[PDB]
Structure formats: structure tokens, C-alpha cells
Amino acid sequence: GRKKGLPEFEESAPDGFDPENPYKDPVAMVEMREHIVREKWIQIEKAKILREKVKWCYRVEGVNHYQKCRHLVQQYLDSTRGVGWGKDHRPIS
Amino acid sequence: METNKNKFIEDWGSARENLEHNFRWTRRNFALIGIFGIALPIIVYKGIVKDFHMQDEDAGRPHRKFL
Amino acid sequence: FDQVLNDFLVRSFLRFGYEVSFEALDKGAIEILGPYGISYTFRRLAERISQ
Amino acid sequence: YFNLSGLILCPVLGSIILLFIPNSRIRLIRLIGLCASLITFLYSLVLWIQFDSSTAKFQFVESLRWLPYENINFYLGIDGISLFFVILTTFLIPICILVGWSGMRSYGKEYIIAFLICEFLMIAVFCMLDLLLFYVFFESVLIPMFIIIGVWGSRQRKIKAAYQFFLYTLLGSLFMLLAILLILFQTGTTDLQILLTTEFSERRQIFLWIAFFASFAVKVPMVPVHIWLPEAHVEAPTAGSVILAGILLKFGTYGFLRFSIPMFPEATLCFTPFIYTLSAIAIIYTSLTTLRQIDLKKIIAYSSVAHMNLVTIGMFSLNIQGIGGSILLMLSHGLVSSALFLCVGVLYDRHKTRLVRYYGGLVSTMPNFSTIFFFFTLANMSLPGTSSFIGEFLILVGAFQRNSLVATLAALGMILGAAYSLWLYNRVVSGNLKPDFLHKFSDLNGREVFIFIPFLVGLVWMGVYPKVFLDCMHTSVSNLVQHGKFH
Amino acid sequence: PISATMVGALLGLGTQMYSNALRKLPYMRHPWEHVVGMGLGAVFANQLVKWDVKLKEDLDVMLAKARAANERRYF
Amino acid sequence: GSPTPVTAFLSIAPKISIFANILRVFIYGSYGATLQQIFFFCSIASMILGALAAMAQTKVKRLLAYSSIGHVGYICIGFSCGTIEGIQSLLIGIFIYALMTMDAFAIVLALRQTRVKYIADLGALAKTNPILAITFSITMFSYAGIPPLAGFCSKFYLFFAALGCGAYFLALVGVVTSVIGCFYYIRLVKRMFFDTPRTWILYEPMDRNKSLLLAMTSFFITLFLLYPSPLFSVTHQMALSLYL
């Protein structure tokens, strides 16, 4: 069987997980790992969406691109500050 | 279809293959083997470890022991 | 400059591509004290335990 | 409903059936061996279609109890990482049967039996989730490849190649086995999922990681022990030389990606600079060594070593770019090195030289082989639009996310890789002919011109559109890099 | 699925032809003992499975007894 | 010196009974823990000297004798670590060694029809009788401890028992002696597949009982790792039955 659609996943964070003793509960480890990776990919796609928005900005902006898209530039950069598995700046989620 | 394989080639080919019989730990070659066997690995190891240390210094995080 | 660059980089790398590695590395020191250079003591150690 | 077990059983059935029939009817033996290999290949492709890339948990699992307590058992299963290795090892075997198709009457039924046993065993290695039994199958390939190398090999030095190959996989293998036993006694089970979710002692991970690396630094051609590959690879048959550089070199990297990166995360961080230095010096030293070679086989055997060493730079750089590029370059090398060694094999099976200086200026005589060789050595260059570039550049990008020195030396590896690759190309296919020892010689017949067509199409498909391959692995790679990294 | 007879009979036939080949004989020299070997292999495999089940349950009983005896030191 | 069938009966039938006798004596009559020391050093010496001496022998029966001594050391590893797992590994090793010794002596008796004496007489045996050559190679690998065969499981679980008791030196010496032990086994392999002597010795065909026993043992050795549960369960029950 299949849902023949998008793979719906539980948005709710899994229960029974303690940051002080993660290794105590093994059965809850894998779904917490999956949830963390899914949230990281959500952030990655948000950054990609902002990149697409500035992509479409730069064409219409013309010579004076700084004037009317400066607000979106900061929005795109702050997303790129906490990106996934990247440079030395590791986000603390 | 097999090549003629003239005699003046296989001797040099085997000499390149059988070079293991010519090694007597000469001092100049001993220094040559030692430098590229130890020093360059040590120099590059210091390079990467100090690159990591300088990267971590700017972020302010304490340096990993890196044993 | 077509001669200085050649002799100083291309010639040097061509010489030292073999001179150091193929002589004092790969087959060599990793072989004389490795598989069968001198660690094959068992052949010299064969006729000492049947006493 | 095609499961994982049928794929494993197909080579077994092909081998058992092949032993029943006698050796007089040689046509039946070759036909049945090729048919079994091809149906296994089709089954592997079918398994690809029904592969869920969304979930992080493993695909089809078949559990067969091994110990009476169900403490450890055959736990088969594929993921984003193991699937493509299974596809590649199912794809290479029919090529292996097809290259020596003319000489089958000289080899016999032992040749196809050995190759199908290798296919079975190599499939069992990649798609299983029991750490101990994976070790059993991991060096179980000793016997069949020992037979293949020794029985049909060099003239008189075939004995020494078999011994060096067999000796390099003993001390490190059993030193790994000691760590296997310590892990089994400490935790209690060898199930991969259980072992991932275990608190290992901080001082303990160093010893276990060192023991694992010791047995993987021999399969992956690291700096201390990599001299076996050139000698034991020239002193090897062409079909035994196309899986030795096509699958066996993947065991070390895959073993790193399965039982080393997850289980020992902080040990991986603590040992990161050392691996970087080893890989960089391996790349540089192999690049400088391979440009003064006259053996027709080692010239690309060293290229294989350089590529495998470059793999570990991004494989050990914990990153989605690094690991993804690692497996992409691994598949790319599994194709390109196989193609290069098939070209060397067809060149050798006509003239029987095993040299480089004998051949020269044969483009006017074998134009088709000239074009095919140019395309293969062109892919070895890592052109964008070819297989190697996407993976290898992804490795460079991923490593430069972590470190800025060592992988610059990795990139400097290709400043000479491309140079000596084209120089090697120009030894043979360029210049005036020398009809003093090249009296008569032909071009590729129908078999070996069609054998490269899958290689060509796979290479271009890697080069122009690798999204489908990256699509199925981004879940597994991201899960791998984030394991034991709570924050 | 294999029912411990599709493997026992196959092993019996295999060992019959294996012993037949070691004497440098044609593989199907005596098919009557080939059928005998198939039957013997099937019977032996079934007996092995049944004995394994009995042996595992007896071992579980022995472990339970040993654990109960060892527990008595604390209490 | 002893006749081949006599040596076949020896090193299997006597050793099993004597090892059961030693188990009965060791478990009950030994509580001072002083037999750990005498078994430790003697088993280590047996391992080392068997591995280092069987490589220098040119006959067949001497090689089997020294292989038997080495396997006796491997089995005696289980006495030093006195636990349920140690005795289990010891008994499993005895069982596997008995099967492999029966198979090897069946091989030797098969070639005894033409008076095989040295190791070089079995040259190019893959041509005259390929299937017997394959059987002998498989049995020799099983002696060596190669993973995809029986004999590797016995050494594996013996090492597990040795590491369970913290006798870390026993594991290391076992590993190194195995490494040297496999070397001369593969040396036996080369002269029997790869290099072909000028003069070939022809062996007359075998009889049905030896062939049947050899086939049964060969299929047991190769396919043991597929279904090893019954042996492990027998051995666990036997180890616990010494007390209850």
C-alpha cells in the first residue's frame, strides 16, 4: 500500500526524549534524529526560497537593485547564517 | 598478431619491475627517504591542525584536543 | 622564460616524480621491512625448531 | 513483490545449476552464466524502482536467525548508500562474463562459477545490517578472488601476487575482528541499529576506531599499504582486474560510511586531521609516481588509488556535500576505472605486451577504440558533463566547508591528474606508427564495441543529470551526518 | 518458502552426486540411490529441525533453572 | 610412523574422551585456580610452536600432526578462561576439529592407494581429479580459519571466550598464531593448484564409503555458518549440565 502522494510526516516532536540523557532511551532516538533532520531541511528550503526570491528580484531590479530589495537581502542572509551542515557557524537548534 | 617484442626492451622493463634489489641505505638517500616519510607528513599535519585551531579561535569555542 | 620555467618546474617535477617516490617509497622500505624483504624470518627460522 | 532475498539467491541458483551440467557442452555453461547474471542485473534495477527515498529507516529486511538466542542474525537491508553499490556490483558481473567470452573454452566452468560466487558474496556484503556477519562476508571474498588471480594470472609471478593480496588482508582483518569481539561483549548484540544507539566510553572509541581503520586502510589504498594494488592488479586477469578496482576498493569506503562514521562520531572528529594528511600525501605521491610508469596496467591502477584517496577527504568531512560527492565519485570511479581496465585488457589480449612504449600511433588503424579510449580517459579527467566531475567537485566543496588547507592539496591533485592522463593518452593513440613489431592487429568486434555502450550511457547520465541519484540518498546522507550530534 | 524438505532433498542429491564425482564416475550413475539420498536428506533435515526445537526449549528450561539458582545468593 | 587408519582413529577418538575427562577433573577437583596457569602457558606454547613448526614440514602426516597440536592449543584456550562460554567454545572447537580431522584423514587415505608420502606428490591434482582437489582445498581452508567455512566459527568463539575473561594476551597470541598458521596452509594450496611439476602421480579412484563420508563432511564444513544453531544449543546445554 501507498498514499500515492506527499509523504506526510508527524510535525509533533517525539515524546520521551531528554537532552541530558539522550542515550538512555534508544527507541526514541531515531525519530528525534529524523525530526531534527527534517527541520534542518525545512530551514534549507526556506533559504532556497529566499534565494529564488532574490533571483527573481535581480532581473526586475535593474541598475538600482539596492534601493527596493535591501530588506529581502537581510532576510536571505539571516537564513544562510543558520544553514544545515555548512561552514564553522553551526546553528544551535 | 603478437608483437615482435625485441630483446632490448624486456630487460629495462624487468629492471624497472625488479628495482627492489638495488637499495643499500645510502646516507643521502636515507635523508631523502626520511624527509618525505616523516617531515612532510609532520609539516602538513601541523598545517591542518593549526588551520583548525585558527578557525576555532575566531568563533571563540575552546580548541578540541585532536589527539 | 620558456627555458627557465621548463627546467625549474617541469623538469624538476619530472625528475622528482620518480627519483624520490619510486626509489625510496612504495616498493622499497615498506617492502624490505614489510611483506617479504626481511620480515620473512620464518624461512631462516624454519630449521631451528626441529632440534 | 520482489524482495532482497531473491536477488541474493539468483547467483546461488545460477551457480548450483551450472555445476549440474558437464563441461563438454561449453555453450550451455556460458549461456546460462550470462543469463543468470543478466536476470540478477534486471532484478537489481527492479529493486531500484520500489525504493522509498523519503523515509530514513532501512528498506526490505530479511532476518534469518544465526545464534540460538537470536543474539546475532543475518539482517539484510538496503538504504540510500547501499542501493547504488548493489546496482553497480550487479551491473559489473555480466561485463566480467562478457569480456572473456571468447576464451571460455580455455577457462572452463570454474571461471563462471567463481564470478557468480563473487557476485553473490559481494551483494551480500553491501545490503546487510549485522556488524559481525558483515565482517564475515567482508573478507569472505579472499577465497574466490585468490582462485581467480592464481589460476588464471601472470606467467610465473602469479604466486607472489596471490600471497601479497592474501597477506595484506590478514593482520588488519583480525585486528579489526578483535574490536568486533570487544563490541559484541560490551554491548551484547551486533545489530547495527542497536550499536548506533549506544554510549561508548570516550577512551574506548579511539581503540575501536583505530582497529576499524586498520582493516579499512588496506582495502582503501592508503599511504602505508597500497603497493598491492599495482602489482597484484597487473598480475591479474582482465575480468578479475575490472572488479578488483570496481568493487573491492569500495569495501573500505563503504565500511567507513557504515560502521565507522556513525558509531564513533567524536573519535571521527579527533582523528580528522590525520586522515586529511594521509589522503593528501597519498594523492600527491601517487600523482608524482604514476607519471613515470611503463607498465600498461599500473598507469591507471595508480589513478584508482588517487581517486580512492580523494574520496576519503570528503567522506570524512562530515557534510551533506562531502558524503554525497563521496558516493557519487565512488560510482563514477567504479565505472571509469572499469572502462579503462577493459580498454587495457582488449589492448593486451591482441598484442600481449603489457608495456606502454610498444603501442604508438594506432589511431589510423583502430579509430573506434581511439574514440572510446579518448572518452574514457576524458571522464577520468573529471570534465563537467562527465561522471567524475560532479562527485569530485562536491567532495572539494564539502571539505572546503570544514578545512581550507588539505583539500586545496586535493584540488592540486587534479592539476597533475589531468596532465598525466592526457600525456598517457598521447603515448599510444598519437604519433607515427611503428610497423616493426605491430604487423597485424584488428579493432573491436561486435562484442567489445557493445560492451562499452552501457558505460558510455551511464557516464553521460551521471554527467548531465545526476539529480536522480542525489534524490534517493539525501535522506540517508543527512541522517548519517547528524547521528550523535544533538544540540 | 523452503520447508526444510526442498533443502534436505537438494543436499541429499548434491552429496550423492558429490560422492559419485569423487570416484570419477558419471554424475547420474545410479539414480535409485539418488532418490534414496533425496529421501534421506529430507528425513535428516526434518529430524534436525525437530531436534533443534526440542533442544532450544530444553536449553531455555536449563537457563531458567540456572538463573533461579544463581538469584538465591542475593535473597 | 603409525599406520594411516590408526592415526585416523587417534587425535579424534582419544582426544575427545580425554578432554571430557579433563573437563570433569578441572570443574570439580580444581578449586585453587592453579590450573589456569598451567593451561595458560602450555596452550600458548602449543599455539606458537605448532604454527612455527608445521610450516617447516615437507611430508603430509607430520603436517597433520602439527596441525593437531596447534588445534589442541586452540581448544586448550578454553580451559584458561573458566566460564560457561569458555567451555562452550572448547566443546565447539573439539567438534569442528574432529570433523575436519576426519575429512583430512579421508583425503590422506584416498591418496594412500598409490602411497603418497610427501607434499610435492600431490602436484597438479586439480587436473587429474579436480573435485578431490577442491575438497582438499576447502578442508585446508577450514583448518586455516577462513571466514566462509566451518573452523572459523570455532576460532571465533574461542577468541570470544578468551576476551570474556580478560585474557587479552590469549587473544593476541591466538590472532598471530592464526596468521602464521594460514600461511603454510596456503603454501600447501599453491603446490596443489598453481604450479605444475614435470612428473605427475596418478591416483586410482576411491570407494563409496570414503567418498560419501568426504562429501558429507565437505557439505557440513561449507554450509555450517548458514545454520549453526543446533551445535551452539547442544554445547550450551552440555556446558551447564556439568552442574545442573
Ligand SMILES: CCCCCCCCCCC(CCCCCCCCCC)(CO[C@H]1O[C@@H](CO)[C@H](O[C@@H]2O[C@@H](CO)[C@H](O)[C@@H](O)[C@@H]2O)[C@@H](O)[C@@H]1O)CO[C@H]1O[C@@H](CO)[C@H](O[C@@H]2O[C@@H](CO)[C@H](O)[C@@H](O)[C@@H]2O)[C@@H](O)[C@H]1O
Ligand atoms: C546446513 C545448511 C543449511 C542451509 C539452509 C539455510 C536456510 C534457512 C532455513 C533453514 C530451516 C531448516 C534447516 C535446514 C538445515 C539443512 C539440513 C542439514 C542436514 C541435511 C541432511 C530452519 O529455519 C527456521 O527453523 C526454525 C525452527 O524453529 C527456527 O525459528 C526459530 O525456532 C525457535 C527455536 O525454538 C526460536 O525460539 C524462534 O526464535 C524461531 O521460531 C529458525 O531456525 C528458522 O526460522 C527452514 O525452516 C524450516 O523449519 C521449520 C520452521 O517453521 C518448518 O517446520 C516447522 O516444524 C514445526 C516445528 O516442530 C512447526 O510447528 C511447523 O509450523 C513448521 O512446519 C519448516 O517447514 C521449514 O520452514
Ligand SMILES: CCCCCCCCCCCCCCCCCC(=O)O[C@@H](COC(=O)CCCCCCCCCCCCCCC)COP(=O)(O)OCC[N+](C)(C)C
Ligand atoms: C565527459 C565527456 C563530455 C563530452 C565530451 C565530448 C567531446 C568529444 C569527444 C570525442 C572527440 C573526438 C575524439 C575522438 C578521438 C580522436 C582521434 C580519432 O580517433 O578520431 C576518430 C573519429 O573522429 C571523431 O572525432 C568522431 C568522434 C565524434 C567527434 C564529434 C563529437 C560530437 C559529439 C560530442 C559532443 C556532443 C554535444 C554534447 C553532448 C551533450 C577517427 O578520425 P578519422 O578522421 O577517421 O582518422 C582516420 C584514422 N586514420 C587516418 C588512421 C585512418
Ligand SMILES: CCCCCCCCCCCCCCCCCCCC(=O)O[C@H](COC(=O)CCCCCCCCCCCCCC)COP(=O)(O)OCCN
Ligand atoms: C551435514 C549436512 C550436509 C550433509 C548432508 C547429508 C545428507 C544425508 C546423507 C545422504 C546420503 C545419500 C547417499 C546415497 C545412498 C547411498 C547408499 C549406498 C550404500 C551402499 O552402497 O553400501 C555400501 C557402501 O558403503 C556405505 O555407503 C556405508 C558407509 C557410509 C559411511 C557413513 C558413516 C556414518 C557414520 C559416521 C557419520 C559421520 C560422523 C562424523 C562425526 C556398499 O558399497 P558398494 O556396493 O558401492 O561397493 C563396495 C565399496 N566398499
